[PDB]
Specification:
With about 70 residues, the protein is mainly α. It is built from 4 helices and no strands. The protein has helices at about 5-30, 35-40, 45-55, 70. The longest helix is centred in the first third of the chain and has 25 residues, at about 5-30. It is rod-shaped, with a radius of gyration of 18 Å. The chain binds one DNA strand of 61 nucleotides through helix 1 and helix 3. The PDB classes it as gene regulation. Keywords: RNA polymerase, SARP regulator, gene regulation. The entry is titled "Cryo-EM structure of AfsR-dependent transcription activation complex with afsS promoter". The protein is DNA-directed RNA polymerase subunit beta. Organism: Streptomyces coelicolor A3(2).
DNA sequence: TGCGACGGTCTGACGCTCTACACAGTGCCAGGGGGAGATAAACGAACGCTGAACGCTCCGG
């Protein structure tokens, strides 16, 4: 079973791989002595991957609150 | 040519509502052509003013 931690970890890994591709493309077209850690990395893929996981996914489900038993189940 | 078999191709895979949701990482400005809106004038029209003018009942000396 992929629990909640492993699923969110996989989504963060996909976002970070996209970020690594973006930063590779950035450093292939950038000069040295003008690179700052605040600049060459972009957090947009990570947040986009997380938000695309928590919504419109078959795993992150709208919790049913009919009764406590349904919540636990 | 006959042979299997190898492979691609192609199809659907009972029914409805109660429910039912939305969608994400990389340039920049100058010169030039059109039409939207404000402007002040214009040719023509009819819109008013001029009371005048025709005709009526009229109270009348």
């Amino acid at each position: 079973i992929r629990n909640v931690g492993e699923l969110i970890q996989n989504q963060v890994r996909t976002g970070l791989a996209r970020m690594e591709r973006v930063v590779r493309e950035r450093m292939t077209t950038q000069d040295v002595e003008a690179i700052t850690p605040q600049t060459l990395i972009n957090i947009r893929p990570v947040v986009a991957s997380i938000k695309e996981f928590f919504g419109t996914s078959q795993l992150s489900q709208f919790m049913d609150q009919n009764n406590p038993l349904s919540g636990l189940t």
